[PDB]
Design a protein around this nucleic acid. Structure first.
Lengths: 91, 98
DNA sequence: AAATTTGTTTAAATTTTGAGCAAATTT
DNA sequence: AAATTTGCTCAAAATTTAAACAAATTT
């Protein structure tokens, strides 16, 4: 009923799903905590970089290197995909 | 003395390791795992929105969290995310945060 | 009362898209 | 040897941008 989820363990050794979006929330909750009113400047492209890399990594692995099927899977242009690959230097 | 904090270790999540010890692992890895799992259930239906699907999962909480920080200040929020104020308002609208 | 933010528009800059081709690669 | 994918170009379509500025708000 909620497609992108990570595995957690509780004190009683029970594994159980939680939305990835709860992780993102936690990480930021943590990031901000460690900052002491130090200014943040490029937080969107920061988190984006943190998410695009592993997404590209995985779909390219799943599509066996096939840029065409990878782009179709993600629903973006083949050109866009190429650009993003070179951006993170994976090609 | 300043220790190097790599980019992968700026956004981290508490995990439990093979010795039942609590450690901080990259958000990257959470995104990897979510996708490894998403592909397991995909045996073997086709997809055509994987970027938008992921993007939404990540934008909502970022927006959620940044607004809480700026105590609803859209100008400071857009300034700290580093995006035009107009696209922040657009994104907020997309997710019902206004 | 002053400083700031919101809500909105308008136009330029930027990025994404699609389409189309030969050369390379997989099948 | 056929079929598909790569690498690369152009354009237009779509989106992000900054720059207003009056009205609403927060300091």
């Amino acid at each position: 009923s909620d497609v992108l989820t990570v595995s957690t363990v509780n004190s009683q050794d029970q594994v159980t799903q939680k939305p990835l979006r709860d992780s993102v929330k936690q990480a930021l909750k943590n990031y901000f905590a460690q900052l002491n009113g130090q200014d943040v400047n490029d937080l969107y492209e920061l988190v984006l970089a943190e998410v695009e890399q592993p997404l590209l990594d995985m779909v390219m692995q799943y599509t066996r290197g096939n840029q065409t099927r990878a782009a179709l899977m993600m629903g973006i242009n083949r050109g866009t995909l190429r650009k993003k690959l070179k951006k993170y230097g994976m090609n």
